[PDB]
Design a protein around this ligand. Sequence first.
Ligand code: HEA
Ligand code: HEA
Ligand SMILES: CCCCCCCCCCCCCCCCCC(=O)OC[C@H](COP(=O)(O)OCCN)OC(=O)CCCCCCCCCCCCCCCCC
Ligand SMILES: [Cu+2]
Ligand SMILES: [Zn+2]
Lengths: 495, 91, 297, 157, 48, 196, 265, 54
Amino acid sequence: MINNIMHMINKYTLTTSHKIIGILYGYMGYIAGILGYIISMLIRMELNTQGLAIVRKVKEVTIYNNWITIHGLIMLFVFIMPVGIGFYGNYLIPMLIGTSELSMPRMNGISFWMLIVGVVIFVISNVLMSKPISSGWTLYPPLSTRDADNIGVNIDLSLLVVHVLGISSTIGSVNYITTNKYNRHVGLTFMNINIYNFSIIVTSILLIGSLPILGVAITGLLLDRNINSTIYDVIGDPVLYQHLFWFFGHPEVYVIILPVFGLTSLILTSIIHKDIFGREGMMYCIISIGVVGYFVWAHHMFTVGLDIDSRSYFSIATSIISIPTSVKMFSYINTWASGRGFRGNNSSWSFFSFLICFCFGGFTGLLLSSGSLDIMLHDTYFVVGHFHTVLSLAATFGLLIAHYFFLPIIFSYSIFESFSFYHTFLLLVGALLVFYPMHLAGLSGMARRVPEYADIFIPFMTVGFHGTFLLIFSTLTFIRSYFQFLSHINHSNYL
Amino acid sequence: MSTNKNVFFPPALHLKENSIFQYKFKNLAVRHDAARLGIILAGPTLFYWFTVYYFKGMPNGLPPVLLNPFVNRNYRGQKRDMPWGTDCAFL
Amino acid sequence: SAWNFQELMESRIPDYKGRPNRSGAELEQVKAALPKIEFMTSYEFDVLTKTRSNLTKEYSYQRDMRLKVTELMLDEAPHELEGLAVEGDAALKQLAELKALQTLTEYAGDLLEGQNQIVQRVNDFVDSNPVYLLDQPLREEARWNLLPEMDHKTRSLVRTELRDWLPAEYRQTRAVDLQQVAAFSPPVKADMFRAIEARAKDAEAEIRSLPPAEQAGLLALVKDNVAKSKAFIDPTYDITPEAINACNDVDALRAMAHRVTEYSGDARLLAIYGKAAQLTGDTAAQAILKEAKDLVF
Amino acid sequence: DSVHVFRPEFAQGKFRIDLDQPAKQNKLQQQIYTLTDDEREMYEDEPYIGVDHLYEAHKGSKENPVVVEAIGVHGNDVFTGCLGGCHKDAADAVAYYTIVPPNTLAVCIDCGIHFVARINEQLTFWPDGTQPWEKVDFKAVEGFLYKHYKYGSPLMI
Amino acid sequence: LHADPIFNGSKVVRSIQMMRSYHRLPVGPEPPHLKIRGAPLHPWSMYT
Amino acid sequence: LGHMRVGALWQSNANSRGLPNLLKEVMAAEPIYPYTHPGLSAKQILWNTKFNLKLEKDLISIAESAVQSQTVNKVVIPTMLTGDVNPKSPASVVAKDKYQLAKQMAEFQYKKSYFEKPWGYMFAYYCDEDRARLCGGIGYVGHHGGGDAEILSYTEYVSTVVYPTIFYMAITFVVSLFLMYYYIYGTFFSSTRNRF
Amino acid sequence: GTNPGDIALNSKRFTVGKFVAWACGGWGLKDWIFPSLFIGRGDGPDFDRIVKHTLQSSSAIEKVNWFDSPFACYTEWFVEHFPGFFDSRYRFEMSAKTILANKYPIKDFPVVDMRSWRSSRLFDLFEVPHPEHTFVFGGPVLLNTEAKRAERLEQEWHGKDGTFVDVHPLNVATESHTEVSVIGGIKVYNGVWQGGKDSWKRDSAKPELTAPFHSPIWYRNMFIVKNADQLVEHFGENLSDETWQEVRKEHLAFHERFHKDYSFA
Amino acid sequence: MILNTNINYGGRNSRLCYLIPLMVHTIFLYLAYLIYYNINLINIYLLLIIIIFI
Ligand code: HEA
Ligand code: HEA
Ligand SMILES: CCCCCCCCCCCCCCCCCC(=O)OC[C@H](COP(=O)(O)OCCN)OC(=O)CCCCCCCCCCCCCCCCC
Ligand SMILES: [Cu+2]
Ligand SMILES: [Zn+2]
């Protein structure tokens, strides 16, 4: 069986087939999602109970800070992008334009294995090693360079993880654009390719333009830590670091969101048995959102001390970006109308949840755009409510739509609809209980990244406790459903 | 039939010029590229060397910059251990 | 110039110009040179080039293959239909024989389809590599142009040469139309009818050399086959001048005129229409018929 | 007076396949473009040519179907497609695709159009420089075609 | 009496086993989706 | 090496599935000659086949010899526009006079009795068979659609559904604006109550 | 769509499979303690419903050749999940027989299988799981490539004259035709041998070798492709719209006694 | 003869699909080691030889 073992290992390591690379991306994405979920459960158990019930010492809150930073990094860079872009991007993009492979078949494998290298370095650095990085997912200096709890090498290893993930994303983006531009079959124009391909193209354009800046910022951090320069010191510009990082920061956000829009549009065409209402309108709105996302980066720094004119300008630009997303939401609402979507499909109900949650998250985030009103809401739990009721309820539910639509196709076994209904509904109700209270705890002044809070905020954390229990139930249901998916019967008798 | 024939035994073409090289310099684009190269070679290069000929026996009177004041000789007590091992510049 | 994003060929947009401009001199010279031209109504061309008997427009070699396979299958029928045994009356035995025959024909049918597919694949190869099957100067015109875009003369020469590249039994030429040739020539129709009668008589003798019940069955079959063969070669062999003269019904003459027009549209039209006009007193019709028999026929 | 010889293109394989018969391979790979909204407006008001569509059988009749030739393996199903809207009740938002047996008469009953897919394989001489430079006869071709039809031939991947 | 296989051979069956368009909705003459109290569920309903 | 296939003959693999033989699927174990050759036994069928085959050979030979040795008195060359490969079809598929209308009507009645209704019934059975195939928990049959589904044209749907929906939405918009402003500030036009 | 496998080794109360299911997913104490609610009726063939549907059928069960077809092994699944199965099958088979017994020389039989469904996205046309290598020999070919292009707009976009697009020189020559025939002393030129697109008619059909030359019989299987979302069918010359509506009404009137006593809930 | 496929590049399996990622991993762990112990794990010239060779 030596030949069989080596053949399997060569199949899954030397491959360049887009289907195999896609399934590998999907697997890694799901695994990292589960890991991030476990860390999130740890964080929630820390918050729910009073008196540092888990760390037991103020000196050891660095464990909680490490938890939040790795939760953020794992869930952003290894859960959504590998799944939303890596998995369906590789599996479907060549098929939807009628071609064999992506351009540059080898660079696809290089991308996946760069992702795996990054995951390995991150997992070893932040688990097997002591006193890990604990500076929040936005590695602000001088906290991430000139501190006492961040001195080990594993911090530098985490920065290099960021580097490798950036390299992987750039390679993937270039490959997607190139394949979609020249390999289309005869008779298919550039703007007639289906909606998903276009969203992937614009996402790839976003990633290409911003990642080098993030690389520059991370190299700055590494140089400050190692060769002892002063780019981001008391005689440096931590605000310069913030500008660069957040110039990358928002394009990453729209990169995350747009492929979910593409997938939802495609699946809708497949399940409502009708075309997209205003397909050209949706494509133009997607490209508009892509372009406008490059001019709004500094709405994450309204309290840094920006010039008053710049504050006004960035509030204006954020509203501008808000417009076309509203156009898209209306287009979705009208698309579902007149259609014959399945009345008992987890895909349908997950689409509903995606639409509602994205509208609510977009509104809450449009409140935060105003510079003046961002005085009272910066670094409170209102921001956490915002980007969790978008990321964890609109991006997650879009991926659930894709998951429940493409499992039968990929594997050829139908879906246990009642099981999936329990999972999706308990995920909806539990998540709402966790994040919705955060909103009213942000207007009340509760800061974020705190393991211990004042007694004024108990009710919100009690509702969060309820939500966390429901979330545990939902995720166990999900994993057990998937295990049941690929397992043959266990009982059989005669009636 | 296959073009391989002309791959194997390509035709030989008669030129009036003594060589192919000259024939390619009757095209405006190549002439303009040669003009750019000549402009760069003639003006700057010849001028630059002329200057080191014209100022061969004269000093550099530029005022040196001021980097590190005496009261800041400790650099605020900041760790400066480079990755090589010793607190010295790679150079 | 530092980038080159070309393709194999730029898309070719046709220039239209228009119909030729000829002055009085050129038009006069063209008119003088041309022969005597009889402009034909589209109906004449239609009746000339209809598909009548060769229903599926099969090539000559396809028909030859089918007839040969039929001969082989007939040769092997007695072996398969020999020794059949099944519990039941005469009807069950008959249906068992029918099923055995069906199995044999299906077996022989699948071989014919295989051979047709093989020959069609050889031809597909012929058109797939015309550059390697042509001599100068047609090779360059095959290389640089597709079939629709070629010059008419070069197009025809290229196609004829490619077809001639094949052996004799692979060339694709439409099979003959028996009904067509019969319709457009009297002697061939008479010869075909004489051959039908001769074969029928020979088969009738063969039948007379058989036991009784087979005699009656096969005589009925021979009569039906003769009738349907005569109908197949020419559906209007009963529209004779004698029949037209014996006919005194306007509706019947109209129906006969329709059936003749459908088939060949020959002088029987003149006879039928003349008699119809006489029964109706149509001087204009008679004048037009005189013109027709002067010019059309 | 000098003799100049241009450097030829030595590449073989797919490059020589595409340079031997550029019209056919261009036809395979060349893009063609649909109409924008302005052109749709300017086209739907174009007039017919003569009174012929009133009498003749349209392109797509059971006697005059639309014939489309693809490449592949003999017997493999053919991917074809309409661009939508052939009949006024057929959607035209995006192209609609079909998979149909190789050499059978098929009917799009959304549009009622009769079509005929057909696969013609691209059997070509091995591109290693031993290609025939002058008209070749049926003998060697006969042998190669026999071997292919019996056992099959590799793919140019 | 068995010939070489061909794709249009006499012994080729319809493809009803292997699924191709999984997410279609069958369309044609179909019964009204009547709803009754207590009657056995119809085979062609979402409820079983 | 396992079970290596010999010869590249046709196998029903994923890419190629072949053309179904509906005649054999329907007429399974039942002969076709009772319908195509009514009232004939196998021996009669074979005898008739041989007789007709010889007759057809004779006729084909005569026709080929005739076309091969006939003098040419007229040359027919159809008119086609340059850049056209074949001439247009002279034939037409539309009845012109009333007699052709009657002929077409008779043919259509026969075809309806013998060709079109069988097609309709076969297609109905096919639709129902597909519905049964996608039933039992395998596909999404019965989730939506049916004979009770209300299908509206574009004009009817826009006029009777979309516009009233937007009208009600506009009413809701104005009413909610006014009631929310009064709910918070306490006055319809004076901002906060008891403060200004 | 499930084969239970070996009923014997899965009916035991305690099994390695059941313990593994409990550990990882699919089984638990709720199944041992409460089997009425969590196993319930279970999934399998329904003898009672099969018997009811069989006894509701008319004599069409006797006269149908279903049991000898290759699909006889699916008899119970269809009898249970296709109310009024035998009557519909009998009508289908009689339709085929009456097509076979026509007077026309070509018998077209409709064929509808899983491939008869069009889709706007290409991944919906492959068998699942998808083949490893797809579109090796290029992507789909569009029927529109055989339609005349928009000559007017094509000329306009390029700024060319485009005045005489609809008027062309007449071509009446003997060098423009390759298919020459002789018909009763008249030499007719007509057509040009184009290639495999001129042989579609014969390759689409298969002859009846025993049919006499004076009454040919050809079998043709016409493939049917439908969108499955259109809700309106246009068959062309095969089936007129009025006839199709009549057939709709007749089918829904006769097949209403096998659908009336069931509820869709 | 040879059956001709589409015009795309079919794609070959190659060892570069993991060698380049392993090279990046090696460079980054080498830098971490140099940062921690102030001495290279292996000679820089040997590392560059490996990188060039791959
Ligand atoms: C995509 C990104 C993502 C996702 C999915 C999540 C998921 C969750 N997050 Fe978090 N979170 C962040 C991004 C994300 N988060 C970021 C960027 C920060 C800031 C870090 C920092 O502030 O520095 C943050 C910070 C953050 C905090 C900050 C605490 C503090 O700052 O005071 C808390 C605590 O309440 C929290 C809770 C949760 C919970 C309870 C879940 C989930 O339990 C709820 C939803 C759970 C799901 C079930 C998703 C799990 C996915 C799987 C189940 C895979 C299965 C497959 C698919 C369905 C595709 N998150
Ligand atoms: C995950 C995806 C995602 C998406 C889509 C968005 C969308 C938006 N986000 Fe945000 N955001 C994040 C992810 C996302 N965000 C994350 C992860 C953070 C935290 C980073 C961190 O600090 O760690 C963050 C943080 C963040 C802040 C930080 C506040 C603070 O830190 O000071 C702000 C404030 O400007 C902001 C604004 C917006 C706006 C204005 C939109 C708009 O795009 C929303 C537009 C949506 C709509 C408008 C809905 C459509 C509405 C209608 C249907 C019609 C109504 C329209 C009008 C009346 C005009 N986001
Ligand atoms: C093969 C391609 C490159 C591969 C790079 C691999 C390493 C990645 C790490 C990136 C950045 C590393 C920075 C560390 C280098 C520190 C250099 C230094 O000490 O600078 C001082 C020197 C000038 O000294 P000065 O005081 O002016 O001299 C007095 C009299 N002349 O100034 C200098 O020497 C400046 C040198 C340029 C600035 C660094 C930018 C990267 C270029 C690589 C240089 C060598 C990197 C050595 C790293 C060792 C580990 C691999
Ligand atoms: Cu932002
Ligand atoms: Zn169509």
